[PDB]
DNA sequence: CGGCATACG
DNA sequence: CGTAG
DNA sequence: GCCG
């Protein structure tokens, strides 16, 4: 088992689903009190299990795994032995790691507000809709429309958004193309959010497009919230008889940008994480969604596609279907 | 022990 | 500070 | 929390 997930293929999904989403809930913990590094931990030790080909069923399968330790060892022991974790029990179960999932997964809000909000005594979304002078316009935005963002997007909806999205990015720029990027690239069946990355052939071209995307789709009643190169939109999403709130990232790059920023968007949140550390540190290569950097040389490499991106840094080639680290 | 990815709005 | 993967 |  490679050290770096990048370094592995990771399925959708695996065969040690209850031990990864325990590890989960100690990684999200770890976040919400700020400790990045037990975070990473946790959150690689989770993903050396769902790169397992089969079920660990005894604690000996650990042995000689990367990123398990005593702690995340003790984890999976319990499990095996008990069915349940106490630790991770308690984690469950407190008012700090309820609320602070609660508040963190309002768009607009983050570990550092969650954590402010918590200390001033506030516990439900009620308590934030009290005092509106306390809140930010994408604040406002992420709790009036926050039931909506909770409900799983499915294929059928990111199908529906594609063709709309595609319909004004052709007026604003023909020949401009979109591509569905994130976890529905990864294979997910279902998500909370749906990611494109728009581009165009001619070097160039792209420049001033987003502006212009946008301006349409507002036209079009299409935009419950927007505020460049990235937008993070709400749209609304047409239903029978009626319509829902949806989270919509819309990105734009140049061609010559464009396997970078794909094989960034399309993730996941780990892998590339994984990949930039991998390429920084074993290839002296500085990583990003805009390019690769040899930074003794001073040059850029050139990318055609994510397969050349692979190549570049010696990896071999995983399909976004198995980039689910 | 230091490091832990790296951008944009 | 928020957002993204 | 773990690696190198
Ligand atoms: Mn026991
Ligand atoms: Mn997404
Ligand atoms: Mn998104
Ligand atoms: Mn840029
Ligand atoms: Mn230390
Ligand atoms: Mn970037
Ligand atoms: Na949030």
Redesign the pocket.
Known sequence: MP?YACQRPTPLTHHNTGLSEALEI?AEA?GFEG????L???C??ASVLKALPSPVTTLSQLQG???????????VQELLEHGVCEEVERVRRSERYQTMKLF?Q??????????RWYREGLRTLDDLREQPQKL?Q??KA?LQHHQDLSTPVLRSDVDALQQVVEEAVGQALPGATVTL???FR?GKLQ?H???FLITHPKEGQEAGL?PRVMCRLQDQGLILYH??????CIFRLPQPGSWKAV?V?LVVAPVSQFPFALL??????????????F???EKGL?????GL?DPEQKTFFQAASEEDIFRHLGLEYLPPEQRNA
């Open positions: 050290a100690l770890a400790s990045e590094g037990r990473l931990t946790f690689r030790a795994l990367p990123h398990f330790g005593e702690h995340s060892s003790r984890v963190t309002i768009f607009g809000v983050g570990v550092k507000t969650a954590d930010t994408q604040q992420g990027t994130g976890g990864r998500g959010d749906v990611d987003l505020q460049f190169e990235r937008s993070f989270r990232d960034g968007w399309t993730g996941s949140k780990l892998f590339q994480r994984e990949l930039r550390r390429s920084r540190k500085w990583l990003n969604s805009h950097f």
